[PDB]
Amino acid sequence: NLPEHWTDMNHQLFCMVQLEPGQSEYNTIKDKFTRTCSSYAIEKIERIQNAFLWQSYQVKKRQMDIKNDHKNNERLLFHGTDADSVPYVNQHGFNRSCAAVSYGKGTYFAVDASYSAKDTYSKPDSNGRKHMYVVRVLTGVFTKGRAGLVTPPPKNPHNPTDLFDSVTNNTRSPKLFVVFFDNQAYPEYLITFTA
Amino acid sequence: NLPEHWTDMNHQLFCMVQLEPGQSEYNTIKDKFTRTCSSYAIEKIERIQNAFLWQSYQVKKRQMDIKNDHKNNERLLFHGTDADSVPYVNQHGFNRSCAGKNAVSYGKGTYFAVDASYSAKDTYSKPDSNGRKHMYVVRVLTGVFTKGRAGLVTPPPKNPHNPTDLFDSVTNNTRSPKLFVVFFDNQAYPEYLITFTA
Numbered sequence: 001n002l003p004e005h006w007t008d009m010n011h012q013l014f015c016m017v018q019l020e021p022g023q024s025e026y027n028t029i030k031d032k033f034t035r036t037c038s039s040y041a042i043e044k045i046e047r048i049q050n051a052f053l054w055q056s057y058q059v060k061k062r063q064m065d066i067k068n069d070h071k072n073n074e075r076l077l078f079h080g081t082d083a084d085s086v087p088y089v090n091q092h093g094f095n096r097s098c099a100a101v102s103y104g105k106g107t108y109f110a111v112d113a114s115y116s117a118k119d120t121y122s123k124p125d126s127n128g129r130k131h132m133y134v135v136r137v138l139t140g141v142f143t144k145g146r147a148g149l150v151t152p153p154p155k156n157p158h159n160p161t162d163l164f165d166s167v168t169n170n171t172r173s174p175k176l177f178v179v180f181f182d183n184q185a186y187p188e189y190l191i192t193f194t195a
Numbered sequence: 196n197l198p199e200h201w202t203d204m205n206h207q208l209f210c211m212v213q214l215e216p217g218q219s220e221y222n223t224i225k226d227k228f229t230r231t232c233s234s235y236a237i238e239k240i241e242r243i244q245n246a247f248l249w250q251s252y253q254v255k256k257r258q259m260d261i262k263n264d265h266k267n268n269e270r271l272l273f274h275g276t277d278a279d280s281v282p283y284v285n286q287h288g289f290n291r292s293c294a295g296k297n298a299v300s301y302g303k304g305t306y307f308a309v310d311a312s313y314s315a316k317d318t319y320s321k322p323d324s325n326g327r328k329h330m331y332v333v334r335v336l337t338g339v340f341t342k343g344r345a346g347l348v349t350p351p352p353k354n355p356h357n358p359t360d361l362f363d364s365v366t367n368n369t370r371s372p373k374l375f376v377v378f379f380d381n382q383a384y385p386e387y388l389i390t391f392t393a
């Protein structure tokens with residue numbers, strides 16, 4: 001069930017596709033970034049076409065849509081990372097066992113590209129090039145996080161296995177989300193940019 | 196679509212089904228267990244019907260069956276755990292983030308035993324306040340494996356010059372495997388829960 005806007009992969013299961021500047025898809029992703037990062041220069045935007053990661057993510061989305069009963073469970077968020085992690089993320093997605101874990105031992109995603117654009121996250125390589133993913137994240141129903149969480153809290157401690165889907169810094173005005181399971185984040189685009 | 200021999204769950208997503216001694220399904224698990232745990236006695240065997248865990252697991256199995264070259268990617272293995280962990284495992288499966296350090300570590304992942312005797316140790320299947328011990332029988336996607344090492348947080352690469360092309364799992368010994376370690380969610384489906392006593 002590979003998305004329409006993906007381009008043909010000649011029966012391959014993984015491809016990175018450089019977007020054509022000035023076309024609708026490139027403009028849409030560029031705008032999401034320049035909303036908070038207009039002072040940064042975009043070198044390129046690549047579409048991540050990973051069939052296996054997409055399949056596993058879409059199964060989790062269908063399950064979360066059933067479990068939560070309607071609800072838009074999905075957010076488009078940012079993740080800054082170092083150049084040496086890019087090949088792993090492209091192929092394998094986001095792994096909590098790799099990665100400050102102030103809101104729990106999960107993978108961290110920012111509402112604003114400006115947050116992920118910090119050198120602590122999108123570490124400049126030898127050439128000054130920084131890397132940030134645009135990520136589909138199953139944030140679902142969320143609560144405030146805290147240090148040391150290995151899974152989100154239960155929605156009521158009377159049923160301690162019925163969990164929140166994610167945690168945040170601030171439930172009323174969230175700026176970051178943490179997810180604790182493989183299959184809850186799909187890296188959709190990679191932005192290569194400079195300060 | 197769920198396996199046709201499962202009990203009808205009436206639109207619900209999760210059920211534990213108590214098996215009957217004398218049925219082939221009960222007897223094969225009892226025999227697999229008794230092969231190395233003849234000094235213990237089984238109280239009951241429950242089939243775990245978890246729709247969501249099954250779906251995510253079978254997707255990962257189809258992927259590994261495509262990726263690997265006509266490999267038997269799945270083994271039926273044992274996992275001892277404490278009573279306090281059973282409700283979470285039944286609902287959510289095996290979380291590497293919750294796993295204990297093994298007495299012989301081949302990596303930071305979830306451990307599965309070839310022999311019920313290994314999982315039957317009090318260190319893994321901790322007797323509860325009523326003297327009941329708990330052991331899962333688990334479909335594990337071992338796939339293509341190599342000898343593990345204590346430092347691993349993922350399986351190692353097959354080839355050092357291609358760091359992202361990974362082994363599926365690691366073992367203590369490739370020639371005579373007795374345990375397997377997996378490092379990803381939905382690589383292991385908890386199929387049966389054995390409750391047993393001395």
Ligand SMILES: CC(C)Oc1ccc2c(=O)[nH]c3sccc3c2c1
Pocket residue numbers: 078079080081099100101102108109110115116121122176
């Ligand atoms: C409070 C703080 C820890 O939240 C964040 C927010 C965004 C990010 C990010 O974009 N990338 C990476 S890579 C390791 C950690 C983070 C991260 C952490």
